[PDB]
Each structure stands twice: as structure tokens, then as C-alpha cells.
């Protein structure tokens, strides 16, 4: 199996590309994992960057969808009201449409849709968690920024965004970050997907202060405190923080790691309940 492009997946308000990896042996009613590239990258680039994901698809029979952004220096829109809001439009709605296309065409399991991404893609994974909790069951954000930090910014790239968020200059209370999540879908009554975040202490692109802000955000959303910590988990220097009963939010801080934390497929697939 290799990566191939979907020319028409339906309405595409973000004007994005869609690339798909379908293993030769699919599960019955396969899961779908959306895998999101970083700024200046591409769908084909992220497919080759996270080399462990496609073999994991082969072994477990789930589908990988790689959306691609060709706007704003190949960055995901995490700034406009449209992209930040449930059913708003722009990139987030295009990605959801890619998901709906995949579930319909490949008889996928709509209760097993997940997303993971790095930097800009991690930022979008948290947008998808807050704005589309009715679509995604779990997200894994590697080296990103809390949901809503860039709201109202004139762009989402190193050359167009307000740089306060990437510089780690934005700090808000857990309650304020929870309020941000609720603004993604005002009046939403339901639950949110499992959230797993990662960051490196040496990240010179996206400040590790953003890790603290993401922790405040999702601990508040789920109403949980740290209950367990694992050192050198899953790798030396990685500190794993487990919240509440462990079913909704966990966080990893990697000592000495920069931009970005390499995807840990076992940790992320187990979080999604797929292995």
C-alpha cells in the first residue's frame, strides 16, 4: 500500500488537499486517523516524516487520512472564527468532510475517528477536539498551542500570526482556557474526546510554556487534577502526567527535546484504544 490523493471528497471550504493511506488488509469497519502536517510541510511530507504510522495501519487495519494545507505558508488555520467554530468553515470543516468521505466510502467506524499532528497540526488537532467533539474520539497533539490562543490573529504561520502564542507570552487561567473550548461550540452539551499532549523543554519554535497552558486547558475541561506521574515514560526524559482516572487527559513533557516531539505511535495508538 502507498499514499494516494482524493481529488473530490465534497465541500472543501479550506481549499485543502486530501491524501489517504489504506492498508491492503482493512479491519471490518476500520478506524480513521487524521494525521496533520506542520507549517511549511505537506501531506506527502508528513506521511514520510512519521514513518511508524503507515506500518501501524498495516498491522491494525485502520485508515490514515493526511490533509494538506496550501494556504498561509502551508499552515493550518487556527485563527479565523470559521475554522475555530463548530460548522464554521475553513480548514477544520474541510478536514471533517474528509473524515465523512472516508467513513462513507470505506465503511469506516464513525466511533473510531482520531487525529494527531505536529506543531501547526497539533494546534489543529486541538481545534478539532474543541469544535468537533461529535466527530473525533481522541486526539494526540505533538508540540502545539492551547485551543483558541490564536483567535483573532491575522494569520497562523511564523510569518503572519501574532507571535505571542508561539513565543509563550500568552498565559490564561484554567477556567479561561476552558471558556475558550466552550466557545468552539456554544451550547454544546456533550463530552469531549480523549486528549493527549506532548512537548519538549528545548522547543525554540513553539515555547514549552504552551504545554503548561494546554495542561490548564484540558484539566479544566474534564475537571481533573494530576493523580499519577511516570518518569522516563515512554522514553528517558519523558515525564507522563496522568489526570483523574486516566480516561480523558494525559500529558508528556520531554526533557531536552526541541521542535518537535517525535510521534510515539504505541503511546498514541494505545490512547486511542486501537492496540
Ligand X SMILES: *[C@@H]1O[C@H](CO)[C@@H](O)[C@H](O)[C@H]1NC(C)=O
Contact partner at residue 189 from ligand X, ligand SXX, none, CB < 5 to 8 Å by partner kind: ligand X
Rounded to whole angstroms, what are the CA distances from 205 to 76, 78, 83, 179, 202? 16, 17, 23, 26, 9
CA torsion 254→260→263→264, rounded to 10°? -10
Binding string, residues 180-199; x marks residues near ligand X by CB under 6 A: -------xxx----------
Place of cell 506542520: 38
Cβ-count burial of 169 within 10 angstroms (0-12 exposed, 13-18 middle, 19+ buried)?
A: exposed
| Residue closer to ligand SXX (CB basis): 22 or 39 | 39
Is 161 one of the binding residues for ligand SXX (CB under 6 A)?
yes
| Residue closer to ligand SXX (CB basis): 130 or 150 | 150
The correct pick among 16, 69, 119, 137 for binding ligand SXX (CB under 6 A) is 119
Contact partner at residue 225 from ligand SXX, ligand X, none, CB < 5 to 8 Å by partner kind: ligand X
The span from the CA of 125 to the CA of 148, in Å, is: 12
Shortest separation between residue 157's beta carbon and ligand SXX, angstroms: 6
| Residue closer to ligand SXX (CB basis): 135 or 260 | 260
- The vertex-120 CA angle with 53 and 231, nearest 5°, equals 65
Return residues touching ligand SXX (CB under 6 A). Answer: 38-39, 119-120, 150, 156-158, 161, 163, 166, 205
Return residues touching ligand X (CB under 6 A). Answer: 187-189, 225
Amino acid at each position: 500500500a502507498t499514499l494516494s490523493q482524493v481529488l473530490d471528497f465534497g465541500n472543501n471550504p479550506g481549499d485543502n488537499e486530501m491524501w489517504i493511506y489504506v492498508p491492503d488488509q482493512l479491519a471490518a469497519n476500520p478506524a480513521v486517523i487524521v494525521a496533520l502536517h506542520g507549517c511549511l510541510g505537506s501531506a506527502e511530507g508528513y506521511y514520510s516524516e512519521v514513518q511508524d504510522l503507515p506500518p501501524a495501519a498495516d498491522e491494525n487495519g485502520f485508515i490514515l487520512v493526511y490533509p494538506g494545507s496550501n494556504d498561509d505558508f502551508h499552515c493550518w488555520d487556527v485563527a479565523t472564527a470559521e475554522s475555530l467554530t463548530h460548522d464554521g468553515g475553513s480548514d477544520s470543516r474541510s478536514i471533517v468532510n474528509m473524515v465523512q468521505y472516508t467513513l462513507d466510502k470505506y465503511s469506516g467506524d464513525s466511533s473510531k475517528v482520531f487525529t494527531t499532528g505536529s506543531s501547526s497540526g497539533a494546534m489543529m488537532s486541538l481545534v478539532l477536539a474543541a469544535a468537533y467533539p461529535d466527530v473525533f474520539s481522541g486526539v494526540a497533539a505533538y508540540s502545539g498551542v492551547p485551543y483558541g490562543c490564536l483567535r483573532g490573529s491575522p494569520g497562523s504561520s511564523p510569518f503572519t500570526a501574532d507571535q505571542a502564542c508561539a513565543n509563550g507570552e500568552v498565559s490564561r487561567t484554567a477556567q479561561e482556557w476552558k471558556d475558550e473550548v466552550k466557545m468552539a461550540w456554544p451550547g454544546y452539551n456533550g463530552t469531549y474526546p480523549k486528549v493527549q499532549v506532548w512537548h519538549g523543554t528545548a522547543d525554540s519554535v513553539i515555547s514549552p510554556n504552551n504545554f503548561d497552558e494546554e495542561v490548564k486547558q484540558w484539566s479544566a475541561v474534564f475537571g481533573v487534577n494530576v493523580t499519577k506521574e511516570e518518569q522516563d515514560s515512554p522514553l528517558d526524559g519523558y515525564t507522563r502526567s496522568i489526570f483523574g482516572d486516566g480516561s480523558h487527559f494525559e500529558a508528556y513533557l520531554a526533557e531536552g527535546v526541541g521542535h518537535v516531539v517525535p510521534t510515539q505511535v504505541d503511546s498514541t495508538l494505545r490512547w486511542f484504544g486501537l492496540i
